[PDB]
Structures are given as structure tokens and as C-alpha cells.
Design a protein around this ligand. Sequence first.
Ligand code: ATP
Ligand code: CA
Ligand code: CA
Ligand code: CA
Ligand code: CA
Length: 270
Amino acid sequence: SHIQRETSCSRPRLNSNLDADLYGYRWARDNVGQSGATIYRLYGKPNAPELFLKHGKGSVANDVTDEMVRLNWLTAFMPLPTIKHFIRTPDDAWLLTTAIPGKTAFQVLEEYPDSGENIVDALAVFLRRLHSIPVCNCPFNSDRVFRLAQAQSRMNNGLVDASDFDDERNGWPVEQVWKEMHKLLPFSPDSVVTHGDFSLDNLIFDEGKLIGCIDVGRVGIADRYQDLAILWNCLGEFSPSLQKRLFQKYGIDNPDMNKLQFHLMLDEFF
Ligand SMILES: Nc1ncnc2c1ncn2[C@@H]1O[C@H](COP(=O)(O)OP(=O)(O)OP(=O)(O)O)[C@@H](O)[C@H]1O
Ligand SMILES: [Ca+2]
Ligand SMILES: [Ca+2]
Ligand SMILES: [Ca+2]
Ligand SMILES: [Ca+2]
């Protein structure tokens, strides 16, 4: 007809890679993470901010990819690391973000046992804020039907780490956890925007203030107990008093035991 669908041209200028940026940085390997992704802190470069590089391989590559897009979306609502560079190849994902300065909620809870109540109060406020984001803004789905189908896949592929089961399920086969979990069903969904892994090592305090969260790969719409149960579990390692204070400050007098138990068992599959 008139104009050709495609026009022979020359090679466009490509993007500047990691090599141009990462030069001059000192490296430190993270030992905290247990997800399989390799993680490094980049520091010691004058006039440059500290960074984190998270590298996922195989199935973990998908996990890091999921983290990147949820990081990209949620950043408009909550304080998150800034995406500096992301690369996806068929079996690899590299995520370079800004470091959030300070210590995790877990660290400050150990280093300062007397600041426990204050820490919990901040966590509750942060959580109320996260759960106040209008659901209509969230492009990500993390409801129980979705997570369960996901959990079943991880089970059938022998990926579920039984050594990470809670004390109550020490020695249980993954099949028994799966079976018993369904006996708690059903329950009425209370859908909000959730974090997916609202644990003490994912929340960072700096100078007496919670200034951000990380590890946002499971962000999406789910029951509010998806975040509550996990944080409640983490606090149990410290004190039942703090657990109680979390719910009090969040706005719930008495925890829904069934909803609490379901999400705690669900988390065993991930
Ligand atoms: N952007 C960041 N800012 C500050 N600290 C970070 C950042 N990214 C990672 N870290 C540090 O590295 C640790 C591991 O990070 P992350 O939780 O993403 O790894 P993971 O393998 O998913 O860990 P987990 O086994 O808890 O899932 C964190 O506990 C945190 O201390
Ligand atoms: Ca590591
Ligand atoms: Ca983590
Ligand atoms: Ca993680
Ligand atoms: Ca577990």
C-alpha cells in the first residue's frame, strides 16, 4: 500500500550497563538471607549511596523479578528501596536497589529490649498505613486461592523446606501440614494490600524511626492476617506481651485464631 510496516534502519544506542555504575564500590556478602538469592552490599564509594544487589537463579530468578515489579508499584505509597538497575535473562535476575540505612526491627529488638513496646507501636502504625491503601490501586493478586495453588506446586516439586517448619510441626510431612491446613477452611476474606512477608528482618529502623521495608516479592491483595500472623509469630520469639500489643495498637482486641493459624501454616510452604 503506502507505508511499509517495517523500515530498515541502523543499530540504536543501547543502555549503559552495570559495569559503568558499579565501578568504585566495595563489596560485602549478606549472610542474613535464606531464600537462595545471592545478596551483596555495595559501599565505600565517596559521593555515592550504598546499594544492594540481589541475584536470583532458576526459580529464584522469578522471585526476584516478582520483587522488582512490586517494588516499582508499591514505592508510590510506602517507603521502599529505589530501583537503580534490573536485569532479566532466561534463568537469571539481577536486582540493584538503594540501601535503606539502619538496623532491622529484629536487631533493635535484641540490642534494645526496653524499646520493644515503642518498636511494636511503630510496626503497628506502618501496618495500618499499608493496609489503608485502596485495593483498587493494587495490580497484584495474593489471595488464599492463589497462594494455595502456589503452595501445592511447591509441595509437588519437593521445594518445601521441612526444616523451616515451626516447632508445632517439627517432623511433620509436608502432606500432613497441607491436609490439616485445609481443615481450618473456610473463612471470610478480609482483603487489603498486604506485604506478604511482614517479618522483623524486613522492617528497618534508623534513629528511632521505621523508615522502610524490603523483601516485597509477595506484595498483593490478601487477608490482613497474611501480615498479622507472620509478624505475630516473629514477636512470639521475644514476648507474648509484644504480640498482644501489636493487635491492640493495630485495632483488633482478640486475634482470629483460625485466620492466624491458617496463615502461619500457609507460610510453611514458602
Ligand atoms: N535494600 C536494602 N536495604 C537495606 N538492607 C538490605 C536491603 N536488601 C537486603 N538487605 C539486607 O539483606 C538481608 C536479606 O535481604 P532479603 O530479605 O531481600 O533476602 P532474602 O534472601 O529474601 O531473605 P529471607 O531469607 O529473609 O527471605 C536483609 O535482612 C537486610 O538486612
Ligand atoms: Ca548470602
Ligand atoms: Ca527477608
Ligand atoms: Ca525473601
Ligand atoms: Ca516456617
